[model samples]
Target: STGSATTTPIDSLDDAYITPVQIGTPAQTLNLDFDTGSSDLWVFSSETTASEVDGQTIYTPSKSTTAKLLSGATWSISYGDGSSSSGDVYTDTVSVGGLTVTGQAVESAKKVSSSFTEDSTIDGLLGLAFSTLNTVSPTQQKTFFDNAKASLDSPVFTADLGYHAPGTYNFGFIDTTAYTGSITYTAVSTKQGFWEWTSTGYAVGSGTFKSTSIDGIADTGTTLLYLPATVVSAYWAQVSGAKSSSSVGGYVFPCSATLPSFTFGVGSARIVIPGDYIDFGPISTGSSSCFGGIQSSAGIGINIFGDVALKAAFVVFNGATTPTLGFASK
Candidate 1:
């Protein structure tokens, strides 16, 4: 148990990076999206109505002799993107890579929104956020990491997500060989059940770094980076033909524009996001118009460091007593 386990990203869409996980006594393997934005280990299950489920895999708890219903317990979750799912709860053994946690709370979906039903590849979501955010009623459930951390050499995990490439998620240990340079640590404020931190300042391209503080969360569930409207406007202004499309709901520009890099500060360490990453693929396949990955978090209330920002650095989600975030070059 002092050792760690690593999981590599399977085939993924633009928004989610899924990995294989096993649940129950017989070990029913399912591909799940590891989301840090929320906490709830929910999955499509046999309890769901046939019509509500598409081609996604389902976990049949009844097939596992170790599964037991958590009487009167239920769970529901809603995402920023409007996707939602609700279900009853079951206690079963859950395993990630080689780590195993017995009697883990597993939410079985009885109802799912169209957003989740349509995603054929993703069977469910494995939340990595704090247990305080767990959606189970009557009693909150601990995440797999929290259950396994006590036996690990270090209570920590690292995320090495790539842009349309295979990435690794290592549990219980940090592999120095996966990154270069020393990791710059920043204190995390998890009051909101998120990996929230303050960026000392930010700059567009090679400009001077300001001293303003931007409070935000690091979310693996989200695909793009979101900042204050003013910050977003300032960055988009540097790109010619970039305009806010009322129809598209964000800034769009020609595919040929020379976008500038965006940098965010963590204490004295600065992480630079390349311009190419800012231009989130095309608006549509075969279309010359492209979407700007950095958008305004106007109504969202807080900025989000999504995949676009996380992929630029090797992130350490420290699960120690202080709970800090360490970032370094990949």
Candidate 2:
């Protein structure tokens, strides 16, 4: 089977992509972020604290005859920034695009952070990463992707993210028209439960390609492109009046600073992100400095190729026994 879903950025900065997915017997639809970094399909639901509920669409399991508790199953996740949510689990029918999965673990949030509560743009996240990272207790549940992979024609999903435009997430088979050049496949290690891989090299703007092994995760859940501090500083140094701000908690520069394009290599293929894509935008209302879309991932020790990088090309998350990630210029 094959399925194609439309995903759109929540706002002008292209912070995150949201896709609508059906989550119940009656098909209670909710807009969710199809995150490739995490492995728990969780959502805001009727069980969530009323005070924690903002404007997000909630999934009411009671309304769906197919929804049932997973016995003692419960899950919780806390991010590096301390935002967290905890929930009980349910087995329900869920569908994305035209692909349907029966008895998918739908973690219904009982409590959520104010940050999550305030973000009405996304109701939850549908995890696309490996199930090894699933937080459910007792017997961890498989992600929707894993359950559907066996039935898919190709057991793969591709992401075609666009800046400020609707992106297409295709499952089962690769869409030939979605990319411009031949697809470059690279070995991916799912040991860490992420679509983690090593890039051959990188080049800043039209500069020479630095043959360095840059290991990172292709994370659709994240917003910015995070690389080594050395690479980040090197790229920012080329911009006039660029500085890493402790107050801003990231590198920021004059809003009009001319950003250098970034390029990363996959095999012999090189994917270049246009300079304009790096200029995220003003930090504050009519501010002079803008936060960079590319920042240092040093603190986390794992570089993240987020939307900033994913938006520049077509990415494939292959679910083979030994998974591989494919990148292509689009």
Candidate 3:
């Protein structure tokens, strides 16, 4: 409620860094991004008739001997970016290595637009964040985790993003080696699902900002980290020629050299953002080198610590057990 939000392109659409999942029996392999922002498991299907399937991972229900289609039921999910997909809800036995979950909810895309399809490598997203935004209805469908708990030998669901390796996103029994367990736990603000932050102002150069304490949220789904003007003013001053001339707000510098390793102290945990994150590619023809780490989302009202911050640490969400939070080294 109080956190800023962003979208996760499944399986590292940015590169070949994403993990893959097996849908249907005998397996139709596809890459998917595990999202904590939402709760749903969706995939593009070749059986989809209305929309052009194109590059998205097409789940051919007909191909999977174990796949089951739900008659007369409709499934559609629209992301924050206005990109969306829909198809008949299907069920099948899903597996991730030694773990197997039966009667899992799967979304097959009958219609997909260029907006969502361009990033084709992202086969789908398996959301493990919360139960509130579940697309699966108890009356219509059961979730992958639900089926796993009922049928799997372990009755446990875990996501092991393999140490910057492929298939780490696979769902099932977790390998403790994937995490170092030096996590810092913070309580969730009940207002929204985003991680809340208590900042005693910001620091830059020799000057430590003596400003009003600002409360912000940490969001993993958001691709860019956003901050208030009070902090932005001090940061931009250090980076050279990082501002783009666009009407839309963003941070940009002439080159990577202009980017600075900025540090943000959230309570006792101080995280440093690499300069490479601030020097981003141009969005437009004449756009300057956009800064990746620091950007302006004026009036967006919440401070969001997106993947830019999360990927740097071993972050965990304990929303399932308590209103508490956790983070540490990978």
**Which of 1 and 3 is ahead in TM-score?**
1
TM agreement with the true structure for every prediction:
0.95, 0.99, 0.76
lDDT by residue for model 2 (94-143), tens = 99999999999999999999889988899998999899999999889999
Tell me each candidate's RMSD, in Å, in order.
Answer: 1.8, 0.8, 5.8
- The worst-scoring run of ten residues by lDDT in candidate 2 lies at 77-86
If the candidates were sorted by their lDDT against the true structure, best first, what order would they fall in? Answer: 2, 1, 3
**How does candidate 1 score on lDDT?**
0.86
- The model with the greatest lDDT is 2
TM-score of 3: 0.76
| Whole-model alpha-carbon lDDT for candidate 3 | 0.56
Candidate 2 or 1, higher TM-score: 2
lDDT of 3 by residue, 188-274 (tens): 664553346555455554555454565665554456667787577678878666563466456556644545566666445555555
- TM-score order of candidates, best first? 2, 1, 3
What are the clashing pairs of model 1? none
TM-score of 2: 0.99
The TM-score between candidate 1 and the true structure equals 0.95
**What lDDT would each prediction earn against the true structure?**
0.86, 0.92, 0.56
